[PDB]
Symmetry: D3
Subunit: 244 residues, 6 copies
């Protein structure tokens, strides 16, 4: 990918919503990760997010290079810790876990990795990351107070705060594997209060899931690959397009 | 009062010279004495009035912000010590995260509580990374910080680069009001080359030669309290370099 | 004194009956709307207006406090969700520690930062231990609490005894504004047996029967919001039924 | 000691100031502690504080044991953890470590021990406990941010807060073994801002120390043989 | 030695079968009522008495520990809830870190404050990682924990491996006294698959069915309380045998 | 490459003499360079290479780790400044807990996240208690520590005994890379009197006389970032 990811997002958003496929480099081998990314490409995905866990970094470079040499959509780093920086990716979500109670996850980890992000000249997309009930594993490991599903005003406050600090992307995270995706009323309130790129993920499995999320205001929909894959992504992209 | 965006105002000045701001704590005097300091400091050549610095009564902030808005014409910038530091009468607010606090409240929690009020008042929000440097003053104690050691400039550079990556366009090296010595020139200089943000430096700046080294080191903005036309030599000092 | 101390006012009422207070959040309506809420609650029998909540502008607090005090003769008590919660125009302030927060700022730090303003303004400070009970509402989340489990009354009692030992004369069991169910009767009663302080219960008290159960279990003060006069009258009569 | 320790304290302060001798039950045997106790009483100390660090409570109980039926000055628990409560003392400084960053030392340890204090019927004196630099071992173990010596305003703010929360005693602690006692202007300022009993302790060695600390506002002086003389005598500067 | 080390005693039993331990809170009864409970539990087949589980004064602890030691021949193991929980009358102490507390005091600070005491007393110290599982009980609340979600066995296995790599030879999955449901079988089995530590499971184990499921899933040691005695313990012990 | 468990190798050395480890920050040079610093280190008499102390990128390690391993025959030991410090090309890892951090992430959290990887890689894990002494350096700042004060050796000895009781067989007194002065001799000695762990001391060890006094006070292992003089100093 030559183009800037952030410019590429704005290009897509003039006409439709963005889908991103999340891959954990630990869950498979680089070659297996390529066949997953390729199946998602055939399904209609717009990019690969790489990371999600806290784990060894050498598998990341291996997975990222195998991706960079075999696909033509951006590879975006979604770091679960400072280990999550690799050269073969096209951008990084440079994120702050806003509702952690631990300074390490809010500010400290990203301070440790900042020079390395600069050294590699990787495009850094400034992002507020907000864990919503139930929160999954990231909500537990990252010491969060998950935002309750019936308190959308709390989510809107953090999104406005993130916008005021300069973050141009905002991510409502229910947690990978959550039984229910982030509520529409919360997605819609956040979208109303901010002019950021709004990313929603966690528990989006069906096309009807993706349509509700997209219809509520999500600019970007993130899903994993648990199911068949090409088919899952295609249905998700269909629901995403089913909205106005 | 101030019509233009304080941030474009900043860039206009920076095309020729460096910026000086006067910090005024609303509690150390009545509103009308603060207009004294404000106008006197404007005569000294300051480019704006920073209001706040401590945790204060908010109705006092409103009265000093009003008194200033009715009488001076340099921008009035809120430098909030807590959510108590938002007032309708100011031109802008340093919307800041205390980056090296160990308490989530000072890093991110306080600002989430105030965000809706900032949006409601529609006050211009300047996104700022705020970094406390040894000794750190009262703000370093109350804000539960680990003040950056003065002989660890690489640490300051890492946080400056992180703030810029998070989208913060201002960065504030804070030695603390009343610090015996200002922020090291080596730190200011290393931060400046790592980031393309507006570098603000404050704390322990008294003399005109304090000004000269801070500004010469790389500061875009110099902040000083009061001790009265002790401002032109800081300005003087800043001048040149 | 022309106006008595709010803490004395409380003890006078507690000589014959239990106290009801009406919580008004200044950010949920306009000052004049707030006045009509208060006047209705006073017609319904409320003994005071508590003013505050998480998410609060100091400008709106002052405007609401000023409007209330022009128009009513019962006390106006600050129930601060942050340091922005202090206003010249109130009669008293619940000077409270959020006992079961995991964040020192809500336990002690916020109160240190405003102690000087409270002393400058000379507003009556009522020393209170504030304890968030499951589910805990928005204050429980913003204040970084570990809400006391509804089935662990011994925990609430330990905090009540400790707050008394530290010299706090009032103790507040907070289920959170809008909780589906008020603090359990068993917990209210056990706290009441373990301490001699004024016991305030709030959160999820909507009906006269809610108020009867909470008052009957031992609350000295019942606190309720205004989501629906009338509602207040039924609550106040519910509390009386227990005498 | 039949009377309430707090009443006792107020009687003393109608004429003079108060001295308390701190004994750590881990530094000596129970009968060795009674020896130090008597010497300081002969020396004019007003009471024995019993605690200072986290130690086995059987150590504490037995040191409180001998002490009770040998002396007639009060025994006051100065707990460093929940281990610090014994049926033997006349009173306990029921304290919150105000400038800890850890909730356990602000509020959590006292909640765990409250039911026990209430069962033993011990008189509990509500105290705000504030650590001043350098702060010593307690400042380090209690995860504190010690109040800088050149920031008396910070200490005054916590004193006002403690009073507002209903704490009737306030302890300015430099840390056992501190090179310098708490700064006079800090003591002066906090005494100006509160009507509580002001206890100061830590690094008060000579009669000059106890004089200067008492002259600055301190109502109670805490020190760790008959060296109490110049302390108590020094506290003669009224 | 006349008396085995408790850790060697555990390994001796484990060559043939699983270990049952009876948890007794000293604050819940008088010392001689505790003797009645403990002797019943021994008749039921328990292998030892754990003593503690609350934060309570050290004087009730010593009295209970003394009375137990006069009357029983199985080890008394301290299961401390704070530094108050150390007593010279026990045979050993679970020297534990609360791995998933967010408060350093419960991870490491409290154990630092009591270590000198443990050394001066003679107490054998069994090194243990203590991991609170949803719902967690009173200990999960007091100890500032983030209880491991029942559907997150991978998290529990990561802390088990970490404790093993740090030198802890015992690992305790704690659902909390009075938990409606015991620690999930899936979590137990994954933890057993990943570590060679002595694996202890407690909380909400009330029937022989519970115990057979917990033991069958891989627990080396089953802990149960006294709420209904000789019968419950026998039922639990026979379940474990199955 | 190694073979032989690093822990046994340490014990074999300590039957005769004290151990020296050479600390290499892989971020402050290139893999081919790091080899030269290492080869020069061993001809100075050092017993192994500690790889990390940072505060780093992890492609730099895996490549310095390989470069060190295929050139050298002393143990390569990871000294992780974060989870970023796990590389399969090393012989062992100081699997450590930052005992006097106020942050649970540095006490226990970070190590839980990397434990599965350490198991997968079969890297020898040495259980270690890591205790920052004032001034504490960069690790003591980043790791949110309350550094042990130099005049409070009882504090360090309390944590030494606690870590022994928890099963950590190595205890590391860290004054910080670049510290002006090394851990107080009274502190090293009191720690040695209180546990039976391998006692490691690092930070602020410059001269042969530096390495003579820390090893003299009780240290089993001496770490330094020259080495010839360090090693002869350690005898004593």
């Amino acid at each position: 990918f030559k183009m800037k990811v952030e410019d590429y997002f704005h290009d897509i958003l003039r006409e439709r919503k963005i889908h991103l496929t999340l891959i954990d480099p630990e869950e498979q081998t680089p070659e297996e990760a390529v066949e997953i990314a390729r199946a998602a490409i055939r399904g209609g995905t717009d990019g690969i997010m790489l990371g999600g866990s806290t784990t060894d970094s050498s598998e990341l470079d291996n997975t990222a290079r195998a991706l960079r040499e075999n696909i033509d959509v951006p590879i975006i780093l979604f770091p679960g810790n400072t280990t999550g920086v690799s050269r073969y990716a096209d951008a990084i979500f440079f994120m702050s876990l806003l509702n952690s109670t631990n300074p390490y996850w809010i500010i400290g980890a990203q301070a440790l990795g900042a020079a390395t992000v600069k050294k590699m000249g990787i495009e850094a997309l400034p992002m507020g990351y907000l864990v919503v009930e139930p929160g999954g594993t990231v909500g537990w490991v990252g010491d969060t107070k998950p935002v309750p599903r019936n308190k959308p005003d709390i989510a809107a406050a953090y999104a406005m705060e993130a916008e005021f600090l300069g973050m141009r992307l905002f991510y409502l995270e229910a947690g990978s594997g959550a039984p229910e995706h982030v509520p529409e009323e919360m997605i819609a309130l956040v979208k109303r209060c901010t002019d950021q790129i709004l990313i929603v993920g966690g528990g989006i499995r069906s096309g009807e899931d993706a349509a509700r999320v997209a219809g509520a205001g999500a600019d970007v929909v993130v899903t994993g690959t648990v199911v068949n894959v090409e088919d899952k992504i295609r249905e998700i992209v269909e629901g995403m397009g089913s909205v106005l």
